[PDB]
RNA sequence: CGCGACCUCAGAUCAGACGUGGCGACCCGCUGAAUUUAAGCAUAUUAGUCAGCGGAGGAAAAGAAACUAACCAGGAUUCCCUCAGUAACGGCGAGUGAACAGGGAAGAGCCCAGCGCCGAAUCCCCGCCGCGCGGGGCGUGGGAAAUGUGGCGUACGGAAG
RNA sequence: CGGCCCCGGCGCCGGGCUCGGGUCUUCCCGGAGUCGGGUUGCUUGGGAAUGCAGCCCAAAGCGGGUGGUAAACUCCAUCUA
């Protein structure tokens, strides 16, 4: 009924701005060229020692141990999840193929 | 072009192809002097993204520093003070090794201006850096309007005052709630501003 | 080898970058013949090789280079390690040669890293295609073997002679 | 040290303060310097008004001051685009531009573009030669005035909707109450808990 | 064996040019105690001060958010009044202690590395030629720097074709 | 107030550079031993550690930082070091 200072829907009622967000918010997006150069340098450099150890761990059914190892190597847990995902992807992309 | 490739290749400096190069270059730099002139930058992309241009008047120096924390110069480890100041062994310098490298380079060459620096190699006993110096009195730099700011006498010895990119980090400057130490200028300026008694005429 | 490299050099000697003297000459003659003949394009674009690692990379990425030649006397190897894999991915023929100064002399500079052949005359197209095949069968078709090959790991002769003495004395004891 | 009865005091005079004491004995001289600088700047820029760059309509962020409105730094790029003038020309026209500010409410967007249109309509600029368009034959005898004070075209004086008086409706006697605010606060506090309870109930089904 | 090119390098009283040191009231970087208070004293306070070292300018630093807030949002930095002796820190003892608002003084914004296009259209030096008072820059020709990357066009507020 | 001498700008007579705005179609869009984490010192009012530094571990591109109490799941706001 009446707009209240507290509640699920508080504050003075206004209309939203449908304007396009600024281009600085769009940063480090997946680009074709960037993905190409990254994938080209990845196969040239190979992998890191801890990356190879984690791939060996993923090859065995022990996955929580590899997650803990990655969380101990890199800083936070949210980075460890993404690293584990990338390692599983690179292990399942070409090693599963003939 | 290719600088993006070199950057994305140097980013993964733990692979074998890069580790071999870093080890060989560290071994090669260990035999040279503590301070010398590199005729061309080992990291061209890193020098370009710092402000190095392939033209006359820009010099590159390679300098090594001793890795490790500092020790108190007190004799026999005696401070003659309260126990809180008995920390002779485990003390850490406020400035970084890169910053003290830039400082040593600018002290050895006063006629040149330290622009920036970057890391090339390191080991257990040494850490190597490459610094960029500008000749403020060369005609190829004084005539270019984009680099005329390095000629003014206000930028004399930027490395000894923390104006470089390495010293700016150790100064503690920044904008946000995490940098309330030095609001305006330096932490000493903030201290002088917040610890002065304002006595107006009418009070 | 000393034969195919010299052949590639003799081929490149025809498409050398145009020097500054004759560049000023042609720029002075262009403004004169333009007012003389009143023509739009009286001089066809001359096919010339492209120098510089950035230019070579931007050409091979867009698949505009017919051939790539690389030097190996570069001090920082990282500026060059990425190029052979890129040419293998793009399918263009790449070849490594000895002497950046020798590569350099054609471009009238002290040091030149890489050179890309993009446009070739109709009468040199056959001579170029005759050598791109031998280059592909030497570098492109053997890329997997080159990537799997590990060099170095060679001990000194003073350390090989002693192990030879030991293996001889051991073989004389076994049989 | 203490006395019979008194407020406990903690004076911050334990430091060495007498060697850093700022006395304002140069305050009249500073005010005179500032006044002379203002006069010199206005005399040098006489055709342009003091505090030349027009400033937009700006609402205070915090809830303590969000009821009043104040001046700001510059107009947003969206407001410039709705006004129809280029971004870089507004600076030499005399319009301060703030590229960092965003626009979240059309209610403020329309007010800002209206202020910009009013400034543009009231603006009269001088050319080098009469060959420049968007002007008149005579510049109103120096525009009837050379310099303006305390805002270029208009200050940010507050206006308020009147809502003078009206007849009370029927259900207004039992429309709102303190219980309404109490229920609103209770729902805002127990919103997620009820959702989790409904989820765990539908789980059993 | 020699020659030549490149690359890491050495010497000169080579041609031209630059730094040293002094003052240091104000400013910047480092480390730097104790007397005192805590009615004693170790944590703490004195103090991130004094002393010590390194630098410049009439100002220096700062300065265009990897910001503040959680509502009707604001918008570089610097200084003043308030916030405030407050939030908070502390043998939670002595004591220490900000910040965001808001109102004022002033308010100027931009560049580059990268990504791409331009036959390197770029820059330094040398010498004769056409110019002005007290002397330095405009047009011409060769010696170097530079393709391991000059310069215009570009900068997150998008840009290019 | 006058007269005299010296210095600096505002208007006018040679010389060298010199396409902006909007819609549409196509492409491009980023700073690394760095962030962050562990640990040890100094410092801060900053408290499951505000900032700096030494050693070790050391990345991503629907990513990263911040949202003042550490940790997991989800969403939101702001910025692009
Ligand atoms: Mg993002
Ligand atoms: Mg040189
Ligand atoms: Mg003593
Ligand atoms: Mg600065
Ligand atoms: Mg009083
Ligand atoms: Mg008494
Ligand atoms: Mg006593
Ligand atoms: Mg005592
Ligand atoms: Mg005292
Ligand atoms: Mg202290
Ligand atoms: Mg002192
Ligand atoms: Mg000095
Ligand atoms: Mg002076
Ligand atoms: Mg910015
Ligand atoms: Mg009070
Ligand atoms: Mg403490
Ligand atoms: Mg107290
Ligand atoms: Mg204190
Ligand atoms: Mg993240
Ligand atoms: Mg985010
Ligand atoms: Mg949160
Ligand atoms: Mg929290």
PDB file of N, CA, C and O (backbone and C1' of nucleotides) in Angstrom, chain E residues 107-137:
ATOM      1  P     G E 107      39.653  27.797  -9.753  1.00  0.00           P
ATOM      2  O5'   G E 107      40.228  26.401 -10.258  1.00  0.00           O
ATOM      3  C5'   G E 107      39.563  25.668 -11.273  1.00  0.00           C
ATOM      4  C4'   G E 107      39.470  24.206 -10.922  1.00  0.00           C
ATOM      5  C3'   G E 107      38.355  23.433 -11.607  1.00  0.00           C
ATOM      6  O3'   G E 107      38.681  23.040 -12.927  1.00  0.00           O
ATOM      7  C1'   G E 107      38.327  22.954  -9.302  1.00  0.00           C
ATOM      8  P     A E 108      37.973  23.763 -14.175  1.00  0.00           P
ATOM      9  O5'   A E 108      38.032  22.677 -15.339  1.00  0.00           O
ATOM     10  C5'   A E 108      39.225  22.474 -16.086  1.00  0.00           C
ATOM     11  C4'   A E 108      39.679  21.037 -16.034  1.00  0.00           C
ATOM     12  C3'   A E 108      39.749  20.435 -14.635  1.00  0.00           C
ATOM     13  O3'   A E 108      39.496  19.034 -14.708  1.00  0.00           O
ATOM     14  C1'   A E 108      41.910  20.458 -15.587  1.00  0.00           C
ATOM     15  P     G E 109      37.995  18.491 -14.894  1.00  0.00           P
ATOM     16  O5'   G E 109      37.943  18.030 -16.417  1.00  0.00           O
ATOM     17  C5'   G E 109      38.658  16.886 -16.861  1.00  0.00           C
ATOM     18  C4'   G E 109      39.870  17.267 -17.673  1.00  0.00           C
ATOM     19  C3'   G E 109      40.342  16.233 -18.685  1.00  0.00           C
ATOM     20  O3'   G E 109      39.615  16.279 -19.900  1.00  0.00           O
ATOM     21  C1'   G E 109      42.184  16.969 -17.414  1.00  0.00           C
ATOM     22  P     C E 110      39.629  15.018 -20.895  1.00  0.00           P
ATOM     23  O5'   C E 110      41.112  15.007 -21.475  1.00  0.00           O
ATOM     24  C5'   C E 110      41.767  13.788 -21.787  1.00  0.00           C
ATOM     25  C4'   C E 110      43.265  13.936 -21.703  1.00  0.00           C
ATOM     26  C3'   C E 110      44.080  12.770 -22.235  1.00  0.00           C
ATOM     27  O3'   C E 110      44.209  12.784 -23.645  1.00  0.00           O
ATOM     28  C1'   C E 110      44.932  13.425 -20.133  1.00  0.00           C
ATOM     29  P     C E 111      44.331  11.404 -24.457  1.00  0.00           P
ATOM     30  O5'   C E 111      45.832  10.937 -24.199  1.00  0.00           O
ATOM     31  C5'   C E 111      46.925  11.748 -24.603  1.00  0.00           C
ATOM     32  C4'   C E 111      48.239  11.195 -24.112  1.00  0.00           C
ATOM     33  C3'   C E 111      48.577   9.781 -24.553  1.00  0.00           C
ATOM     34  O3'   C E 111      49.101   9.720 -25.869  1.00  0.00           O
ATOM     35  C1'   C E 111      48.990  10.002 -22.240  1.00  0.00           C
ATOM     36  P     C E 112      48.830   8.429 -26.785  1.00  0.00           P
ATOM     37  O5'   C E 112      49.743   7.294 -26.137  1.00  0.00           O
ATOM     38  C5'   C E 112      51.157   7.415 -26.135  1.00  0.00           C
ATOM     39  C4'   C E 112      51.805   6.442 -25.181  1.00  0.00           C
ATOM     40  C3'   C E 112      51.653   4.967 -25.513  1.00  0.00           C
ATOM     41  O3'   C E 112      52.551   4.527 -26.515  1.00  0.00           O
ATOM     42  C1'   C E 112      51.213   5.307 -23.218  1.00  0.00           C
ATOM     43  P     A E 113      52.203   3.233 -27.400  1.00  0.00           P
ATOM     44  O5'   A E 113      52.483   2.008 -26.421  1.00  0.00           O
ATOM     45  C5'   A E 113      53.777   1.791 -25.880  1.00  0.00           C
ATOM     46  C4'   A E 113      53.816   0.568 -24.998  1.00  0.00           C
ATOM     47  C3'   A E 113      53.162  -0.682 -25.561  1.00  0.00           C
ATOM     48  O3'   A E 113      53.981  -1.368 -26.491  1.00  0.00           O
ATOM     49  C1'   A E 113      52.471  -0.378 -23.326  1.00  0.00           C
ATOM     50  P     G E 114      53.370  -1.858 -27.893  1.00  0.00           P
ATOM     51  O5'   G E 114      52.181  -2.834 -27.477  1.00  0.00           O
ATOM     52  C5'   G E 114      52.438  -4.038 -26.770  1.00  0.00           C
ATOM     53  C4'   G E 114      51.157  -4.728 -26.375  1.00  0.00           C
ATOM     54  C3'   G E 114      50.215  -5.072 -27.517  1.00  0.00           C
ATOM     55  O3'   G E 114      50.576  -6.277 -28.166  1.00  0.00           O
ATOM     56  C1'   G E 114      48.999  -4.059 -25.757  1.00  0.00           C
ATOM     57  P     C E 115      50.512  -6.387 -29.765  1.00  0.00           P
ATOM     58  O5'   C E 115      48.957  -6.535 -30.075  1.00  0.00           O
ATOM     59  C5'   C E 115      48.194  -7.579 -29.489  1.00  0.00           C
ATOM     60  C4'   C E 115      46.715  -7.335 -29.651  1.00  0.00           C
ATOM     61  C3'   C E 115      46.254  -7.000 -31.059  1.00  0.00           C
ATOM     62  O3'   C E 115      46.092  -8.150 -31.870  1.00  0.00           O
ATOM     63  C1'   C E 115      45.295  -5.473 -29.531  1.00  0.00           C
ATOM     64  P     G E 116      46.910  -8.286 -33.246  1.00  0.00           P
ATOM     65  O5'   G E 116      45.971  -7.581 -34.319  1.00  0.00           O
ATOM     66  C5'   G E 116      46.505  -7.057 -35.524  1.00  0.00           C
ATOM     67  C4'   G E 116      45.631  -5.960 -36.073  1.00  0.00           C
ATOM     68  C3'   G E 116      46.246  -5.099 -37.164  1.00  0.00           C
ATOM     69  O3'   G E 116      46.194  -5.702 -38.444  1.00  0.00           O
ATOM     70  C1'   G E 116      45.242  -3.709 -35.546  1.00  0.00           C
ATOM     71  P     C E 117      47.440  -5.562 -39.447  1.00  0.00           P
ATOM     72  O5'   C E 117      47.229  -4.138 -40.128  1.00  0.00           O
ATOM     73  C5'   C E 117      46.149  -3.912 -41.020  1.00  0.00           C
ATOM     74  C4'   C E 117      46.059  -2.463 -41.423  1.00  0.00           C
ATOM     75  C3'   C E 117      47.348  -1.826 -41.916  1.00  0.00           C
ATOM     76  O3'   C E 117      47.640  -2.130 -43.269  1.00  0.00           O
ATOM     77  C1'   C E 117      46.315  -0.393 -40.352  1.00  0.00           C
ATOM     78  P     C E 118      49.168  -2.192 -43.766  1.00  0.00           P
ATOM     79  O5'   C E 118      49.613  -0.663 -43.842  1.00  0.00           O
ATOM     80  C5'   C E 118      49.000   0.224 -44.765  1.00  0.00           C
ATOM     81  C4'   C E 118      49.308   1.667 -44.451  1.00  0.00           C
ATOM     82  C3'   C E 118      50.765   2.091 -44.553  1.00  0.00           C
ATOM     83  O3'   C E 118      51.193   2.309 -45.887  1.00  0.00           O
ATOM     84  C1'   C E 118      49.845   2.935 -42.552  1.00  0.00           C
ATOM     85  P     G E 119      52.742   2.609 -46.211  1.00  0.00           P
ATOM     86  O5'   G E 119      53.231   1.331 -47.027  1.00  0.00           O
ATOM     87  C5'   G E 119      53.609   0.134 -46.355  1.00  0.00           C
ATOM     88  C4'   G E 119      55.089  -0.152 -46.488  1.00  0.00           C
ATOM     89  C3'   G E 119      56.023   1.000 -46.113  1.00  0.00           C
ATOM     90  O3'   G E 119      57.203   0.476 -45.505  1.00  0.00           O
ATOM     91  C1'   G E 119      56.438   0.342 -48.338  1.00  0.00           C
ATOM     92  P     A E 120      57.316   0.361 -43.905  1.00  0.00           P
ATOM     93  O5'   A E 120      58.220   1.604 -43.486  1.00  0.00           O
ATOM     94  C5'   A E 120      57.732   2.936 -43.598  1.00  0.00           C
ATOM     95  C4'   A E 120      58.538   3.907 -42.769  1.00  0.00           C
ATOM     96  C3'   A E 120      59.996   4.079 -43.193  1.00  0.00           C
ATOM     97  O3'   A E 120      60.400   5.424 -42.943  1.00  0.00           O
ATOM     98  C1'   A E 120      59.911   3.305 -40.965  1.00  0.00           C
ATOM     99  P     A E 121      60.258   6.535 -44.094  1.00  0.00           P
ATOM    100  O5'   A E 121      59.265   7.612 -43.468  1.00  0.00           O
ATOM    101  C5'   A E 121      59.071   8.871 -44.094  1.00  0.00           C
ATOM    102  C4'   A E 121      57.650   9.354 -43.943  1.00  0.00           C
ATOM    103  C3'   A E 121      57.204   9.709 -42.532  1.00  0.00           C
ATOM    104  O3'   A E 121      57.610  11.009 -42.141  1.00  0.00           O
ATOM    105  C1'   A E 121      55.532   8.412 -43.619  1.00  0.00           C
ATOM    106  P     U E 122      58.868  11.218 -41.161  1.00  0.00           P
ATOM    107  O5'   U E 122      58.686  10.099 -40.045  1.00  0.00           O
ATOM    108  C5'   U E 122      57.923  10.351 -38.875  1.00  0.00           C
ATOM    109  C4'   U E 122      58.677   9.951 -37.632  1.00  0.00           C
ATOM    110  C3'   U E 122      59.966  10.712 -37.363  1.00  0.00           C
ATOM    111  O3'   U E 122      59.749  11.961 -36.731  1.00  0.00           O
ATOM    112  C1'   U E 122      60.359   8.395 -37.132  1.00  0.00           C
ATOM    113  P     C E 123      60.819  13.149 -36.895  1.00  0.00           P
ATOM    114  O5'   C E 123      62.038  12.707 -35.968  1.00  0.00           O
ATOM    115  C5'   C E 123      61.880  12.594 -34.562  1.00  0.00           C
ATOM    116  C4'   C E 123      63.070  11.920 -33.925  1.00  0.00           C
ATOM    117  C3'   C E 123      64.415  12.589 -34.154  1.00  0.00           C
ATOM    118  O3'   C E 123      64.646  13.686 -33.290  1.00  0.00           O
ATOM    119  C1'   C E 123      64.612  10.272 -34.560  1.00  0.00           C
ATOM    120  P     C E 124      65.532  14.930 -33.785  1.00  0.00           P
ATOM    121  O5'   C E 124      67.032  14.461 -33.524  1.00  0.00           O
ATOM    122  C5'   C E 124      67.496  14.198 -32.209  1.00  0.00           C
ATOM    123  C4'   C E 124      68.886  13.615 -32.220  1.00  0.00           C
ATOM    124  C3'   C E 124      69.931  14.406 -32.992  1.00  0.00           C
ATOM    125  O3'   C E 124      70.472  15.482 -32.246  1.00  0.00           O
ATOM    126  C1'   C E 124      70.065  12.127 -33.596  1.00  0.00           C
ATOM    127  P     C E 125      71.033  16.788 -32.996  1.00  0.00           P
ATOM    128  O5'   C E 125      72.339  16.274 -33.752  1.00  0.00           O
ATOM    129  C5'   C E 125      73.462  15.794 -33.028  1.00  0.00           C
ATOM    130  C4'   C E 125      74.488  15.177 -33.945  1.00  0.00           C
ATOM    131  C3'   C E 125      75.039  16.086 -35.030  1.00  0.00           C
ATOM    132  O3'   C E 125      76.055  16.951 -34.557  1.00  0.00           O
ATOM    133  C1'   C E 125      74.457  14.000 -35.974  1.00  0.00           C
ATOM    134  P     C E 126      76.238  18.410 -35.202  1.00  0.00           P
ATOM    135  O5'   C E 126      76.980  18.127 -36.583  1.00  0.00           O
ATOM    136  C5'   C E 126      78.219  17.433 -36.614  1.00  0.00           C
ATOM    137  C4'   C E 126      78.603  17.056 -38.022  1.00  0.00           C
ATOM    138  C3'   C E 126      78.599  18.190 -39.034  1.00  0.00           C
ATOM    139  O3'   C E 126      79.767  18.989 -38.979  1.00  0.00           O
ATOM    140  C1'   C E 126      77.463  16.333 -39.941  1.00  0.00           C
ATOM    141  P     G E 127      79.644  20.591 -39.004  1.00  0.00           P
ATOM    142  O5'   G E 127      79.486  20.937 -40.551  1.00  0.00           O
ATOM    143  C5'   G E 127      80.558  20.724 -41.456  1.00  0.00           C
ATOM    144  C4'   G E 127      80.111  20.878 -42.887  1.00  0.00           C
ATOM    145  C3'   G E 127      79.301  22.125 -43.203  1.00  0.00           C
ATOM    146  O3'   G E 127      80.103  23.278 -43.384  1.00  0.00           O
ATOM    147  C1'   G E 127      78.228  20.247 -44.135  1.00  0.00           C
ATOM    148  P     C E 128      79.435  24.738 -43.328  1.00  0.00           P
ATOM    149  O5'   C E 128      78.900  24.969 -44.810  1.00  0.00           O
ATOM    150  C5'   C E 128      79.779  24.875 -45.920  1.00  0.00           C
ATOM    151  C4'   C E 128      79.025  24.820 -47.224  1.00  0.00           C
ATOM    152  C3'   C E 128      78.051  25.956 -47.479  1.00  0.00           C
ATOM    153  O3'   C E 128      78.689  27.135 -47.937  1.00  0.00           O
ATOM    154  C1'   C E 128      77.025  23.894 -48.020  1.00  0.00           C
ATOM    155  P     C E 129      77.919  28.542 -47.878  1.00  0.00           P
ATOM    156  O5'   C E 129      76.893  28.463 -49.093  1.00  0.00           O
ATOM    157  C5'   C E 129      75.646  29.135 -49.036  1.00  0.00           C
ATOM    158  C4'   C E 129      74.588  28.402 -49.820  1.00  0.00           C
ATOM    159  C3'   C E 129      73.185  28.983 -49.731  1.00  0.00           C
ATOM    160  O3'   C E 129      72.984  30.085 -50.599  1.00  0.00           O
ATOM    161  C1'   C E 129      73.082  26.663 -49.342  1.00  0.00           C
ATOM    162  P     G E 130      72.821  31.567 -49.997  1.00  0.00           P
ATOM    163  O5'   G E 130      71.275  31.672 -49.627  1.00  0.00           O
ATOM    164  C5'   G E 130      70.377  32.408 -50.446  1.00  0.00           C
ATOM    165  C4'   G E 130      69.078  32.682 -49.731  1.00  0.00           C
ATOM    166  C3'   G E 130      69.198  33.336 -48.364  1.00  0.00           C
ATOM    167  O3'   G E 130      69.355  34.743 -48.444  1.00  0.00           O
ATOM    168  C1'   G E 130      67.721  31.496 -48.230  1.00  0.00           C
ATOM    169  P     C E 131      69.781  35.587 -47.146  1.00  0.00           P
ATOM    170  O5'   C E 131      68.405  35.851 -46.389  1.00  0.00           O
ATOM    171  C5'   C E 131      68.376  36.581 -45.172  1.00  0.00           C
ATOM    172  C4'   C E 131      67.157  36.248 -44.349  1.00  0.00           C
ATOM    173  C3'   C E 131      67.237  36.610 -42.873  1.00  0.00           C
ATOM    174  O3'   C E 131      66.936  37.973 -42.618  1.00  0.00           O
ATOM    175  C1'   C E 131      66.456  34.390 -43.098  1.00  0.00           C
ATOM    176  P     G E 132      68.066  39.103 -42.803  1.00  0.00           P
ATOM    177  O5'   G E 132      67.826  40.101 -41.585  1.00  0.00           O
ATOM    178  C5'   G E 132      68.525  39.936 -40.361  1.00  0.00           C
ATOM    179  C4'   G E 132      67.622  40.165 -39.176  1.00  0.00           C
ATOM    180  C3'   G E 132      68.186  39.759 -37.822  1.00  0.00           C
ATOM    181  O3'   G E 132      69.045  40.738 -37.264  1.00  0.00           O
ATOM    182  C1'   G E 132      65.981  38.928 -38.050  1.00  0.00           C
ATOM    183  P     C E 133      70.534  40.341 -36.806  1.00  0.00           P
ATOM    184  O5'   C E 133      70.791  41.232 -35.511  1.00  0.00           O
ATOM    185  C5'   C E 133      70.882  42.646 -35.607  1.00  0.00           C
ATOM    186  C4'   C E 133      69.980  43.329 -34.611  1.00  0.00           C
ATOM    187  C3'   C E 133      70.307  43.103 -33.143  1.00  0.00           C
ATOM    188  O3'   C E 133      71.356  43.933 -32.675  1.00  0.00           O
ATOM    189  C1'   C E 133      67.988  42.801 -33.490  1.00  0.00           C
ATOM    190  P     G E 134      72.515  43.323 -31.746  1.00  0.00           P
ATOM    191  O5'   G E 134      71.976  41.874 -31.360  1.00  0.00           O
ATOM    192  C5'   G E 134      72.871  40.838 -30.980  1.00  0.00           C
ATOM    193  C4'   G E 134      72.792  40.555 -29.501  1.00  0.00           C
ATOM    194  C3'   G E 134      72.655  39.093 -29.108  1.00  0.00           C
ATOM    195  O3'   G E 134      73.888  38.397 -29.113  1.00  0.00           O
ATOM    196  C1'   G E 134      71.069  40.369 -27.922  1.00  0.00           C
ATOM    197  P     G E 135      73.987  36.932 -29.769  1.00  0.00           P
ATOM    198  O5'   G E 135      72.806  36.113 -29.078  1.00  0.00           O
ATOM    199  C5'   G E 135      72.960  34.734 -28.777  1.00  0.00           C
ATOM    200  C4'   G E 135      71.891  33.891 -29.426  1.00  0.00           C
ATOM    201  C3'   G E 135      72.367  32.572 -30.020  1.00  0.00           C
ATOM    202  O3'   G E 135      72.467  31.549 -29.037  1.00  0.00           O
ATOM    203  C1'   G E 135      71.043  33.720 -31.611  1.00  0.00           C
ATOM    204  P     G E 136      72.501  29.990 -29.434  1.00  0.00           P
ATOM    205  O5'   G E 136      70.962  29.581 -29.479  1.00  0.00           O
ATOM    206  C5'   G E 136      70.554  28.294 -29.913  1.00  0.00           C
ATOM    207  C4'   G E 136      69.174  28.337 -30.515  1.00  0.00           C
ATOM    208  C3'   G E 136      68.945  27.412 -31.703  1.00  0.00           C
ATOM    209  O3'   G E 136      68.599  26.099 -31.290  1.00  0.00           O
ATOM    210  C1'   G E 136      68.192  29.595 -32.237  1.00  0.00           C
ATOM    211  P     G E 137      67.996  25.026 -32.326  1.00  0.00           P
ATOM    212  O5'   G E 137      66.438  25.360 -32.365  1.00  0.00           O
ATOM    213  C5'   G E 137      65.532  24.532 -33.078  1.00  0.00           C
ATOM    214  C4'   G E 137      64.529  25.348 -33.853  1.00  0.00           C
ATOM    215  C3'   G E 137      64.294  24.903 -35.288  1.00  0.00           C
ATOM    216  O3'   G E 137      63.359  23.843 -35.377  1.00  0.00           O
ATOM    217  C1'   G E 137      64.665  27.238 -35.238  1.00  0.00           C
TER     218        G E 137
END
